Amino acid sequence: GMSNKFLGTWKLVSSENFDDYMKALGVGDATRKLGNLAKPTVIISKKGDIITIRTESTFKNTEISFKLGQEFEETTADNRKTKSIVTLQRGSLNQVQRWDGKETTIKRKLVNGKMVAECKMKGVVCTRIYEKV
Numbered sequence: 001g002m003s004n005k006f007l008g009t010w011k012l013v014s015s016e017n018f019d020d021y022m023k024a025l026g027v028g029d030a031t032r033k034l035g036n037l038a039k040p041t042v043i044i045s046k047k048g049d050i051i052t053i054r055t056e057s058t059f060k061n062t063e064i065s066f067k068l069g070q071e072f073e074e075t076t077a078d079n080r081k082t083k084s085i086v087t088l089q090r091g092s093l094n095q096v097q098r099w100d101g102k103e104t105t106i107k108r109k110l111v112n113g114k115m116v117a118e119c120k121m122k123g124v125v126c127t128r129i130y131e132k133v
């Protein structure tokens, strides 16, 4: 299953192309301004086969609990009501969000101890790097 190296508290240290990714989601100007200034902490925890990913930031908090491969209702930070699935592909934790005929992916993988989150929407790719704290 998911590597236990995912479990723990993660702090954003780098974000690239987040503004254009938010635009792709349809996020308004003022919201993106605070979204680009946020330095969220991500906590990944596990209770049995239920994985929990909590994101904490001054602006917004989110939390999703899921089992690999099983669709679930999700509310994103920008307040999208999506049906989402998390899968494992070569150790990569890949989350797909679907809503209003749209689709975006957030792929999380471990690289030299860092967690690297690739966010894709249409032809827009955003990379966010976290470090274990």
Ligand SMILES: CCCCCCCCCCCCCCCC(=O)O
Residues within 6 Å of the ligand: 022, 025, 027, 031, 034, 035, 038, 040, 042, 055, 056, 057, 059, 060, 061, 076, 077, 078, 106, 117, 119, 128
């Ligand atoms: C939680 C801070 C950002 C809040 C601003 C809302 C803009 C919508 C962005 C929602 C998708 C976030 C993708 C980041 C994924 C991650 O790095 O874990």
Ligand SMILES: [Cl-]
Residues within 6 Å of the ligand: 037, 038, 039, 040, 056, 057, 058, 059
């Ligand atoms: Cl923050």
